[PDB]
């Protein structure tokens, strides 16, 4: 199927750290015009498919951004990436959408170094979204 337990997103510590981390990251993020996890991410995606989407984003995020940048934004990073990693697993599974996920991915890459920043600044969003999507 494709969902997470409500309890996943009801651990205030990590929830906080995710927002703190996203907050740190976003302090460095000036592209206010460009939001990765935004409406245009789900544009065309049924609420049903949202979680698969968020699964996708979460993975890209983890692999392309958080794992590589795990060395930064401490302590939050070392706390939140694991958490999100876990979600990656619970969510390994399934049911195009990439045309959106890719848009996000391509955006992060176009933004280069600030794309990592933004991606991290949006962990709260990835979180919030992940939650609402699963």
């Amino acid at each position: 199927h494709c969902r997470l337990d409500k309890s996943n997103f009801q651990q205030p510590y990590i929830t906080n750290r995710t927002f703190m981390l996203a907050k740190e990251a976003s302090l460095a993020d000036n592209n206010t015009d460009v939001r990765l996890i935004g409406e245009k991410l789900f544009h065309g995606v049924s609420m049903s498919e949202r979680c698969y989407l968020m699964k996708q984003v979460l993975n890209f995020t983890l692999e392309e951004v958080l794992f590589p940048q795990s060395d930064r934004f401490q302590p939050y990073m070392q706390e939140v990436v694991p958490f999100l990693a876990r979600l990656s697993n619970r969510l390994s599974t399934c049911h195009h959408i990439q045309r959106n996920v890719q848009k996000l991915k391509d955006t992060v890459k176009k933004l280069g170094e600030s794309g990592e920043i933004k991606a991290i600044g949006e962990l709260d969003l990835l979180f919030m979204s992940l939650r609402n999507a699963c």
């Binding site: 009801q10 205030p12 510590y13 929830t15 906080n16 927002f19 907050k23 976003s26 302090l27 993020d29 206010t32 015009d33 460009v34 939001r35 935004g38 409406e39 245009k40 600044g121 709260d124 969003l125 919030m128």
Partner: protein, 173 residues
């Protein structure tokens, strides 16, 4: 000359954009806001050419889990400061909840601080639910109550934000 310390004061999901004047001719301010990811900035017409050092953006920022920006530029005598932007603002995360007001008769009746959602015409969820708030009643020393309701049985109350593990300061008593 940019507006200074431009930030959201966020209490009870009332999101007042506030800022300081910065270097000097008397100044006025134009407040703009946006949801993170919006390309355009919305002008806050209530705070547009204002001599005020704050701007109520509550209505504008009432999707509480939304990332918001506010920015202010000053203008004095025809010259405009650059836009001073706030950090990304997510009411849900940033807002501080006042204590509930507590009435006892014991029958404790907790009133959440005034919260913009009190006003939402149509609600699918209670305010406490919406804001994922809990009331905590204590009797000076122990938590006698925690719920989104108001409780059957010196007594003090607070609002807890289970999601953020945040407790409001204490109600009076």
């Amino acid at each position: 000359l940019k507006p200074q310390r431009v930030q959201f004061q966020s209490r009870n999901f009332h999101n007042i954009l506030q800022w300081q004047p910065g270097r000097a001719n008397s100044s006025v301010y134009f407040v703009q806001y946006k949801i993170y990811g919006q390309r355009q900035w919305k002008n806050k017409e209530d705070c547009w050419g204002t001599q005020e050092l704050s701007c109520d953006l509550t209505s504008e920022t009432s999707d509480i889990q939304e990332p918001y920006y506010g920015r202010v530029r000053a203008a004095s005598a025809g010259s405009y400061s650059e836009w001073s932007m706030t950090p990304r603002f997510t009411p849900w995360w940033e807002t501080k909840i006042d204590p509930p007001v507590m009435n006892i008769t014991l029958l404790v009746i907790l009133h959440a601080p005034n919260l913009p959602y009190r006003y939402q015409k149509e609600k699918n969820v209670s305010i406490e639910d919406y804001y994922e708030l809990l009331y905590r009643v204590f009797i000076i020393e122990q938590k006698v109550y925690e719920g989104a309701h108001r409780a059957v049985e010196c007594v003090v109350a607070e609002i807890y934000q289970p999601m953020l593990d945040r407790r409001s300061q204490r109600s009076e008593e």
